[PDB]
């Protein structure tokens, strides 16, 4: 959908230019642009791409600081789970807490999706149902999901502005592995903040998840007693996402993957 071009300003500033490959960039990027504008307005403890050039001809922004975390010959490698710097979880907790605290009404005024907590729960229910109607779901997996869905103590009572596509490759870090920015904001919306914790669980296990929760809680982010359990059930609902991708992509490999992951 776009070619990426690095370059430098006359004044020595590094830039990223997005060359559009399709004639519908504007309505297809409007949400991302709005989200980025929002995040840049309110965030001060991390960077997000700031699209100060936004047209059909061109979308361009000043290059963020730092390097993406993890893998990029074969010089730079994925994060070593045996040796994660503590500053990593602490700083990601700081960043997510700031992001998740950005005023929801400001999002509601824009074209971003904004879920109350009840709408986030209902959203998960419907996505599960849709997926099941298309592919079916194994009995034990389905029962686990339903048990989670119906468990009032698990579900958060507040929603916030999330990034929605948090992975190592989307996290900009400095030399000390302090997170300094995030990229790729296409999934930004106001919803269950738990989505932004899934990465830590999957890449770093229960320990990493706990480290992140601890930092987030300590710096003032919204916390509830079953948060960790909830994030783990949300992780257990990943096959919904795989099935969703099979449906939209029509790619057979992922239909196969979906069916295997849905335990049918």
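^ Assign residues to that structure.
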């Amino acid at each position: 959908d776009f070619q990426a071009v690095f370059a430098q300003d006359n004044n020595g500033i590094d830039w990223v230019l997005r060359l559009p490959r399709r004639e519908d960039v504007m309505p297809r990027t409007k949400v991302e642009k709005q989200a980025l504008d929002l995040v840049n307005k309110y965030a001060i403890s991390f960077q997000a791409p700031n699209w100060i050039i936004y047209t059909e001809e061109l979308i361009a922004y000043k290059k963020l600081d730092g390097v993406p975390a993890g893998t990029i010959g074969n010089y730079i490698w994925e994060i070593d789970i045996n040796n994660v710097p503590e500053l990593f979880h602490k700083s990601l907790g700081r960043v997510l807490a700031e992001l998740h605290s950005i005023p929801s009404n400001k999002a509601a005024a824009l074209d971003l999706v904004v879920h109350t907590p009840e709408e986030a729960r209902m959203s998960m229910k419907q996505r599960m149902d849709a997926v099941r109607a298309k592919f079916g779901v194994g009995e034990n997996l389905w029962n686990r999901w339903q048990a989670w869905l119906n468990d009032d103590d698990m579900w958060p009572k507040k929603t916030g502005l999330i990034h929605g596509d948090v992975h190592a490759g989307h996290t900009m870090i400095d030399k000390d592995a302090n997170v300094t920015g995030l990229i790729d904001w296409t999934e930004a919306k106001v919803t269950d903040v738990s989505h932004d914790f899934i990465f830590n669980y999957r890449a770093f296990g229960e320990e990493g998840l706990e480290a992140l929760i601890l930092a987030y809680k300590e710096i003032g982010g919204y916390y509830w007693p079953k948060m960790k359990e909830h994030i783990i059930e949300l992780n257990a609902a990943y096959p919904v996402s795989i099935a969703e991708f099979a449906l939209v992509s029509g790619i057979e490999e992922y239909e196969q993957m979906a069916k295997e992951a849905l335990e049918v």
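The chain has nine helices and nine strands.
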